[model samples]
Target: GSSGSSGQLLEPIRDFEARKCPVHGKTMELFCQTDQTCICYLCMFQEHKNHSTVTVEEAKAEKETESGPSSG
Candidate 1:
């Protein structure tokens, strides 16, 4: 008789948390298009000055809508 694998495995649910910037130790709220990454406000001023950037929330929203159902 072959043993059937029918046991259910319990998986841990992960909670979403905001990421922090390594250098500034601040919450990475902004998405820097120039660097193509998330960055803290301090990083924006120090390294990403004048670079294209948007809030993390906004970036995510934009990406979601862009990838949403296309009529064309």
Candidate 2:
């Protein structure tokens, strides 16, 4: 990691947001309708308000079933 005027570029590594909610900065443990992306509980009431939603685990299993490996 490189260092800037202040310190090393450690925030990016320590503050990993890939699995975090872009709006709430919380871990994305749920999936919303359409199965397009992951979101957090707070998100469910905001942008996803009134929209169908499901757990991340449920979505994963659903997609896997659709993918065929779970079809056998």
Candidate 3:
């Protein structure tokens, strides 16, 4: 939703083959936090109030486990 495409660039946040966000089903380069993972606008908005996720480095440093990539 915020990828910068026509309608908010609602495409996947990163490459599916590469373990993206692993939490928000990221698939382009949503944020400047990392590469293999990046949350889309829809993901940021949806999980904004429903998820307990954080930056890749933060999560990795916090020792938090991810539920893998998901669009819901």
Candidate 4:
């Protein structure tokens, strides 16, 4: 007990930000606004083609803005 290092956080960092695409088994680097699924580039050119796509960060911003004060 004297060592004084539990090495843990009170709130764990969830891996939701690191979700993967079921199609390509790759990191979900993009967000498809229409289909509403995180996807990889391969998915972009396929089924998600012509649909609105943005980086995960961009979609996060859009989501926060859409749900800002109203979400409360």
lDDT values of the candidates?
0.78, 0.75, 0.50, 0.77
Candidate 3 Cα deviation (angstroms), residue 27: 3.2
Top-down lDDT ranking: 1, 4, 2, 3
Tens-digit lDDT string for candidate 1 (1-72): 568776677755442344778897787888998878989888889878899877787678776756565443
lDDT score, residue 46, model 1? Answer: 81
Clashing pairs in 1: none
Better of 2 and 3 by lDDT: 2
RMSD of 1: 7.0
Off by over 4 Å in 4: 1-18, 65-72
What C-alpha lDDT does candidate 2 achieve relative to the native structure? 0.75
Q: Candidate 4 clashing pairs?
A: none
- Which ten-residue region of model 3 has the weakest summed lDDT? 28-37
Q: Against the hidden reference, what TM-scores do the models get?
A: 0.61, 0.57, 0.29, 0.58
Distance from true position, residue 37, model 2, in Å?
1.6
Q: What tens digits encode model 3's per-residue C-alpha lDDT throughout 1-72? A: 766647444566464557555666555234333333456555656645354435545446435665566453
Q: In candidate 3, which residue pairs clash? A: 1-10, 5-9, 13-27, 13-28, 14-27, 14-28, 22-68
- Which residue pairs overlap in candidate 2's backbone? none
Query: Largest TM-score belongs to which candidate?
Result: 1
